[PDB]
């Protein structure tokens, strides 16, 4: 349902 929703930039910066 929310596939094409906007990006806000709250992505976790993955280390591994």
């Amino acid at each position, epitope marked *: *349902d*929310a*596939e*094409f*929703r*906007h990006d*806000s930039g*709250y992505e*976790v910066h993955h280390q591994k």
Partner: antibody
Amino acid sequence: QVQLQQSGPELMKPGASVKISCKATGYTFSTSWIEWIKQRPGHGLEWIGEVLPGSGKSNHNANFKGRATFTADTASNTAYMQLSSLTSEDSAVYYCAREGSNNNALAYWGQGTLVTVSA
Amino acid sequence: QIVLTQSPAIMSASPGEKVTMTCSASSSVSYMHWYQQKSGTSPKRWIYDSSRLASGVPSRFSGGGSGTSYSLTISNMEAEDAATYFCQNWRSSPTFGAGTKLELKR
């Protein structure tokens, strides 16, 4: 405080088009997305789409097949959802919502608009 | 790609009892949002970013988890806590879980 207020209930004939409004206050209208959520009893909560006011940008749920259009009027701080070719399946409570200040949870919700599609 | 499963669908808790409801993801997710809904009213943001309580949410509520399993916990069940709780994550499809209906046990 951020507030979202929706237009009242709509009684519709099958095949008609409905336009629901969402008046936004307490923040800069052009810097946040107004999002739309469908709720039927026995179906939970479904994301329908969104508009970024003053940008001309909108995003859609593909399962709605272009029947849902999302617009905004920056002069009156009001966002709009239009749903055409209404069926009994479209009978639901429709919410407008917005992200939090420093989080992407839907912190702010409209009171909901009941759409009843009936002959 | 990522499916959310709320177990169980109906949860029964006596007044005073500790309550834990789980939102399981089919693959790892970095956060979980939780929303409270009572009959006839809009969902309210309840717990956001896995553990952060919204303004006005009582201290008996808490949230936690990581990866494929997240939870909402009530330390002592009160009558006003009876509602449906939806878990939610934007990387999930559908984005909202089916909901856990929390009722009073007798």
